[PDB]
Design a protein around this ligand. Sequence first.
Ligand SMILES: NC(=O)c1ccc[n+]([C@H]2O[C@H](COP(=O)([O-])OP(=O)(O)OC[C@H]3O[C@@H](n4cnc5c(N)ncnc54)[C@H](O)[C@H]3O)[C@H](O)[C@H]2O)c1
Ligand SMILES: NC(=O)c1ccc[n+]([C@H]2O[C@H](COP(=O)([O-])OP(=O)(O)OC[C@H]3O[C@@H](n4cnc5c(N)ncnc54)[C@H](O)[C@H]3O)[C@H](O)[C@H]2O)c1
Ligand SMILES: Nc1ncnc2c1ncn2[C@@H]1O[C@H](COP(=O)(O)OP(=O)(O)O)[C@@H](O)[C@H]1O
Ligand SMILES: Nc1ncnc2c1ncn2[C@@H]1O[C@H](COP(=O)(O)OP(=O)(O)O)[C@@H](O)[C@H]1O
Ligand SMILES: [Mg+2]
Ligand SMILES: [Mg+2]
Lengths: 185, 185, 96, 400, 398
Amino acid sequence: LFKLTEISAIGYVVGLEGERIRINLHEGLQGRLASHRKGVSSVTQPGDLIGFDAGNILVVARVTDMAFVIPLRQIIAYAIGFVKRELNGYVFISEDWRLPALGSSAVPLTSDFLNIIYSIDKEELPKAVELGVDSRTKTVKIFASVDKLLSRHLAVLGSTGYGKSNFNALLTRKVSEKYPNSRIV
Amino acid sequence: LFKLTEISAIGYVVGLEGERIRINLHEGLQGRLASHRKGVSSVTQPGDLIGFDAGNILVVARVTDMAFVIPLRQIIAYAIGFVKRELNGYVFISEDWRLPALGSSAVPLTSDFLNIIYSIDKEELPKAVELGVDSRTKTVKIFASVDKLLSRHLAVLGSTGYGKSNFNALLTRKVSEKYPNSRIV
Amino acid sequence: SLIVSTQRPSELSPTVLAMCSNWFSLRLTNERDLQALRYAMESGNEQILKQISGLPRGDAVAFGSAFNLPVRISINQARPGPKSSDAVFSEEWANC
Amino acid sequence: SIYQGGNKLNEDDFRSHVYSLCQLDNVGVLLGAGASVGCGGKTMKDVWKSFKQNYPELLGALIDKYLLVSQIDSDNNLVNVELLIDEATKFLSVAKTRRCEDEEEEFRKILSSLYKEVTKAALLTGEQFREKNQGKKDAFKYHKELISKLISNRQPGQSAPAIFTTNYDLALEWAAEDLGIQLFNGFSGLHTRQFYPQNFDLAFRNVNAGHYHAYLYKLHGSLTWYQNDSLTVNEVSASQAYDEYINDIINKDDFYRGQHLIYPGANKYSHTIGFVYGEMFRRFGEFISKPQTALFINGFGFGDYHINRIILGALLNPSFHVVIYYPELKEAITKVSKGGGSEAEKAIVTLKNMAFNQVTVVGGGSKAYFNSFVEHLPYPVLFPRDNIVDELVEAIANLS
Amino acid sequence: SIYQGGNKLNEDDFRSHVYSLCQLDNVGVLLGAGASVGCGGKTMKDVWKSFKQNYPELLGALIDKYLLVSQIDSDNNLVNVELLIDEATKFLSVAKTRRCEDEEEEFRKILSSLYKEVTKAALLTGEQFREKNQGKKDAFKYHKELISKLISNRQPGQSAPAIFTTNYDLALEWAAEDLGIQLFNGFSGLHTRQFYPQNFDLAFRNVNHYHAYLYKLHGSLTWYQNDSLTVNEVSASQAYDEYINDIINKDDFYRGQHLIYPGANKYSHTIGFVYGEMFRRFGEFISKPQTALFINGFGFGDYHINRIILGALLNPSFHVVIYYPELKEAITKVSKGGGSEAEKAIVTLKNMAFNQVTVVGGGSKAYFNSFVEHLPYPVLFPRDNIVDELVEAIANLS
Ligand SMILES: NC(=O)c1ccc[n+]([C@H]2O[C@H](COP(=O)([O-])OP(=O)(O)OC[C@H]3O[C@@H](n4cnc5c(N)ncnc54)[C@H](O)[C@H]3O)[C@H](O)[C@H]2O)c1
Ligand SMILES: NC(=O)c1ccc[n+]([C@H]2O[C@H](COP(=O)([O-])OP(=O)(O)OC[C@H]3O[C@@H](n4cnc5c(N)ncnc54)[C@H](O)[C@H]3O)[C@H](O)[C@H]2O)c1
Ligand SMILES: Nc1ncnc2c1ncn2[C@@H]1O[C@H](COP(=O)(O)OP(=O)(O)O)[C@@H](O)[C@H]1O
Ligand SMILES: Nc1ncnc2c1ncn2[C@@H]1O[C@H](COP(=O)(O)OP(=O)(O)O)[C@@H](O)[C@H]1O
Ligand SMILES: [Mg+2]
Ligand SMILES: [Mg+2]
């Protein structure tokens, strides 16, 4: 009928030591793809992002290891932050001093929650210009506030033949089309 | 009579410790040398290339270590890129953010797959300049592009009595013949 | 405010590079060129520095006060852009 | 108006504090008689007003002869109805034992009116009490939210939430039945339900490895509990109770079943009726005495003595935190300053003026009602705020 | 053309999405009557169209006297076959048990004509239904590719593909026998073949990738009931020798319980066993987590299939893909007002605000031939077929 979580649980925490987290999976997953109401996501490859259901907050972790214990599969991850709701939206706090408890579920992160992580304030959106998309998924759009970029000095580095003049032209031309009354030499 | 894989297997993935790939060899001495329809290949010394089957891609790796654990045997390797089909053939890419999943199989690479690793982008044939063959196997022919080799400066180094003048003479004469309207001093 | 572009970050003062609050770092392959970025800030950021060796052509890594968390970005292609290239030898040598 | 030991603080601090307390080992909620007004219920003062307006003749004889009810309180409307039926039943029992035939004809007619009036304010739906699927109406919209919010924020390895109550109404059960969650009240069986005092220690687990359960305690009985010709307690459905005795009470003008009912705390002198209230009080006292309890109170008028004594005695604990709702702070303080208010006012004002950060009292009149209390609780991040299930069912029902 | 939750998709996103669903834990395919039209089969409308002109005098009785089929549906060609077959069988049973010889003789001609018409389209090669090596021909070249694609795309240690069908033709077995792949239909034995429901729990092993599960929901031409109360299966040649050649070339319908197709005679205590087992297996298969299913060639005229499919989407991990050619006309007819219930169902499922439903339309881009190419090959899959040269060299030297 009605389940507490709208996203299908994958594994369960079996052991904890503090700084790192250990996870085992159910025996019915071999294809490294987990499905939800939105689409399909990858969970097992190193460098990806996963989450756990703990109380009224959501914790975000990163996959680093895939080592053998039908055998069992083990995953080691570390925490980077948590997601909270206050009035009608979502805020991402950048502290990881809280850890989940034993037996908690590990869940993937959909495209909706991935947009929130790489986002800024709503009122600063009208005065922002796009830069590009994420490389792992090619679906998220990254914005930047000109108020904070052009306050201190900005450093651009890169080797010969890998697209720095293109970035310079794209960044400089957009501001000119945005604020007619500005000086750049 | 129905055969899914016409190339023999060697081992399977047991560990993924970050950027490292761990492989266990199969029973018998078949993991030392393998034979297929085209010829005889081997994986016995650090610095060779092996492939992992992952469906639409073929991850290419280079081996570094080999040791005992008749006991169990292990191989560690690192990744380079992957190979995929485009229209009716194959295309090589040199991006190494991709890793295979646990439980796959490793197969030796035939001469038909070393050629695509060291080829050009299907359009620079008219300005192709021949240099030599690869040293490890002596089966792949190396070419170069006039518009990109002798466009900027170039460096030829080495000690005394080891063949600098031979390379100079070969390159100069081969460049002279392709277009009879070139100036060299 | 200034914008600094170079391919040899080692040829800059420790003071001039440390004034920046942002660092857009593209592909870099040299041992002596990678110490400046690490030394610009104290520890707590190591996972984002190991990727820089094997980045592809077009993408970039950006971190600073303009980002809540470091982001790996795929930059667009502006149209029209700068000049394509300088003179090419084959066409001039083969005009006849 | 939120008060913490004689100070003042705004809403943001209160919300942060509530969120902090909503992640402790033990959580309890206490609801009184004022929380059922959003469905069509009535408060005891309204019941007394209706009684003294509908039956005037018996009021005169209830003062001069027996001197059980004071003259002053009847005008001020501070009459404890729950403690009148006990004295009336005691009088009737002693008169019947002495075999005084003429005395019964009055005490057997004053109890019929009281039970006629008391019942009518507890149906909560009037005539539509015997029907089916009464939890899908818009009246009970908040109780489902309260139950879901309390249930869906417990980490693995933590106790299921416990709900205490005082009303003898059928609102929480109706609300919980629609969600599909089973509540524990101690009764077992279908064709013959009996009370098992040791049944409050069971949970649900999956044979392969859902976990949707919550306890419920009633401290003043319920409309559907009765004692048969034997000595045992039984439970039936709303339709069965309406067919058996509720209709007879509500319509027939010369009907009095006797000591067949169980509400509200009526015949506590019988030794087969107090066995329920004893366990209720035992479990309440055992729960609030736990090391890391976090409690909520709402709708409770503090008209009793033992509950207040138990709460105050439990307050001398270094790790007990309480939150109290009382929408009469200022009007009570005005009376307290001059000469002091009634007993409830004195009790609440003497509790509030304690110099502790554990106790917290909230004022603001209509801002401290049940409706506002409902959404003050946190909300899960993964909880779906979308319309999916209710639309697929409609699509399925359209197929024909 | 392509819709998923109200938006529109392009070709590359559709291809990438299709590839990702083929790597799921559970895969499944449902092929309808349309899949056989590419090799000799006929649509349900064509059967009634042919029967109207072949046997005209019997059409009046079915409407004027007995009142089984109405008028407007016959004019528009929206009449079933199985339901009227079942009703005719029930009527004949009542007439026989009531001793009414006047009406009993009438239904034999009707049932014989209907079964002859069904059989004359069920066959896929005509007179060569009894010869050998029918999978060596060219018309069955796409079922082979479907089987190979759905088998080769499974990681070692995973499950096996499951195939569901609603036909009673012999194309799939004929294709599977040529490759060297064994399909488990539930029967066992050679001289006496019998149905055991527990045979669907079997698998192979090597003592020192081969097998798939085929569920038929309308029986076959090679299933019949003998005098003993156990169903039996024979080869196509034996069926042609025994009870297939007679219906086509002769006028004889004395076997009111022998045949098992299609979806009829459900009032018997032996025939309903097979239908119940197949339907229960199909219904309980798609309740598993991490599942994917494709639908092709199946018009949505079945109420129970539609009901269970719509009710299965309530799970968070159920994904479906539908191929429906006549899509725009359905929208035009339902906006103005018209169409049958199937168009209503497809429209009311297309507009859903879900990401788990995909509908593909067109005129020839949604046919069975194009469904195969959307499924990929592995990079290591051999294709340079040279063993045939060795085979012919071996055969030539004798
Ligand atoms: N000795 C016993 O066993 C015994 C006997 C009788 C009563 N009781 C208990 O039950 C009593 C409760 O009944 P009461 O009639 O005294 O008043 P109450 O405590 O139920 O309600 C307090 C006040 O809240 C007002 N209110 C209206 N709507 C509200 C809302 N949505 N949220 C909050 N408050 C709202 C009520 O009108 C007013 O009574 C006392 O709490 C307590 O004495 C115990
Ligand atoms: N024995 C019975 O119970 C009985 C009787 C009559 C109909 N039916 C069936 O009719 C409906 C199911 O549809 P069906 O498939 O069984 O027959 P059907 O004739 O209803 O559907 C076939 C569909 O496929 C389309 N199509 C034609 N050629 C195609 C091609 N090359 N590629 C792809 N699609 C093509 C046709 O336009 C359309 O008719 C009911 O759901 C089902 O019961 C069953
Ligand atoms: N993000 C990008 N997307 C597409 N093409 C790019 C991108 N970055 C660089 N290029 C291409 O790379 C080539 C060389 O880049 P260029 O800007 O000249 O490098 P540099 O400035 O370091 O010399 C050009 O064809 C340019 O368009
Ligand atoms: N690629 C080669 N294969 C075979 N012999 C070579 C090759 N390169 C150089 N040599 C040998 O090296 C000699 C030339 O050396 P040279 O280049 O004159 O020495 P130095 O580097 O001091 O000028 C020749 O005799 C030639 O046989
Ligand atoms: Mg430039
Ligand atoms: Mg020299």
